[PDB]
Design an enzyme around this catalytic site. Structure first.
Site: not given
Ligand SMILES: CONC(=O)c1ccc(C)c(Nc2ncnn3cc(C(=O)N[C@@H](C)c4ccccc4)c(C)c23)c1
Ligand SMILES: CONC(=O)c1ccc(C)c(Nc2ncnn3cc(C(=O)N[C@@H](C)c4ccccc4)c(C)c23)c1
Length: 335
Positions: A46, A29-31, A27-28, A161
């Protein structure tokens, strides 16, 4: 009770995760988005990039994990799981973090509809509620923008983030972008004002091409700093630069945000000011009349005391790695 892990390559890195997490999709470290078979919910996984290959990376890894383990608030993304395929500290080289998967980010929302005033009120209220909590732990976001604000079908919002920074240009408080005067937690409030303006109008408030153009657009609205604010400008180079620009008067925001709720305009006037000593705080903003329908002082909690003494330490990679490993093993998932 180590789960069984499985390995796969996803353009083009190795992902080694518990069988619990199925159907990974980048969907996106790498996510990656994935399905959590234990709970029936979709999650975001992630994989930290090269977490222990340098001191800076090692410390950032620890920083992020500590933050995620401590922050527990409805409007702040929560840690659902943290794992490593490693069986011991000696083998510990990769770290994975898991959170709920949301429905969309604010960029997606604004690109797809048009938001009503109540919708804006609720979104901004939630952002401020999360910021009040984060700020109370002596943590700031520093890079708040529409892409790190996620919502789910019911407009329920989470901040992502935060506390990591130690397009961004469009939402950055000028005092940090231009290093021109002291700053405080209200750098995040400037960002909220920019975001709120965009939700209201559907357009980026200050879409600058570079830092110079960015400042130009800002001053066209807020007015060039004059004698009063210049007294607080610590940077001589900044004072010289400011005085070299074409002077612009402040605009009455009501003439800009035509048709907006007058209370929304008043709140924006309080957020989008250049003087960091004068800018409204998250707590003060929550008490603004714009949020009368949502505000409840008994339901806008603060954070438990947060020990970030590690920030002042200078340790080796293996030392930060060991501290991180400790936190991975001691993790207890949310009830
Ligand atoms: C203190 O900093 N660390 C953090 O905050 C931190 C740490 C670890 C993690 C795993 C995360 N979460 C995310 N990280 C990066 N991209 N991402 C995207 C979403 C998402 O739900 N996208 C939706 C719109 C979506 C829905 C459907 C498909 C594609 C995208 C989320 C929840 C994240 C944040
Ligand atoms: C960080 O690494 N660089 C170093 O070694 C280092 C060490 C010490 C200092 C004092 C700095 N200066 C800055 N540091 C971070 N942000 N920043 C933003 C600006 C800026 O936009 N000035 C405007 C008003 C401007 C615009 C045009 C002309 C003159 C000034 C400046 C000059 C900085 C960097």
């Amino acid at each position: 009770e180590r789960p069984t892990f499985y390995r796969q390559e996803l353009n083009k890195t190795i992902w080694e995760v518990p069988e619990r997490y199925q159907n990974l999709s980048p969907v996106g470290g790498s996510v990656c988005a994935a399905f959590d078979t234990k709970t029936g919910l979709r999650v975001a996984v992630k994989k930290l990039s090269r977490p222990f290959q340098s001191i800076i990376h090692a410390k950032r890894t620890y920083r992020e994990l500590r933050l995620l383990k401590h922050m527990k608030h409805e409007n702040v993304i929560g840690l659902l799981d943290v794992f490593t395929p490693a069986r011991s500290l000696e083998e510990f080289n990769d770290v994975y973090l898991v959170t709920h998967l949301m429905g969309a980010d604010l960029n997606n929302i604004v690109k797809c509809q048009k938001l009503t005033d109540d919708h804006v009120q609720f979104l901004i209220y939630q952002i401020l509620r999360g910021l009040k909590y984060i700020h109370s732990a002596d943590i700031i976001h520093r890079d708040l923008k529409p892409s790190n604000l996620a919502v789910n079908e019911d407009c329920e919002l989470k901040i992502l983030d935060f506390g990591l920074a130690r397009a961004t240009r469009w939402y950055r408080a000028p005092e940090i972008m231009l290093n021109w005067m002291h700053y405080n937690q209200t750098v995040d409030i400037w960002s909220v004002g920019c975001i709120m303006a965009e939700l209201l109008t559907g357009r980026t408030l200050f879409p600058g091409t570079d830092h110079i153009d960015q400042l130009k657009l800002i001053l066209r609205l807020v007015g060039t700093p004059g004698a009063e604010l210049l007294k607080k400008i610590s940077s001589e180079s900044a004072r010289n630069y400011i005085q070299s620009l074409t002077q612009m008067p402040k605009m009455n925001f009501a003439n800009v945000f035509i048709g907006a709720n007058p209370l929304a305009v008043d709140l924006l006037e309080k957020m989008l000011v250049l003087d960091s000593d004068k800018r409204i705080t998250a707590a003060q903003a929550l008490a603004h009349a714009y949020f009368a329908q949502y505000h409840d002082p008994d339901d806008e909690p603060v954070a438990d005391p947060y020990d970030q003494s590690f920030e002042s330490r200078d340790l080796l990679i293996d030392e930060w790695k060991s501290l991180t490993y400790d936190e991975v093993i001691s993790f207890v998932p949310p009830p």
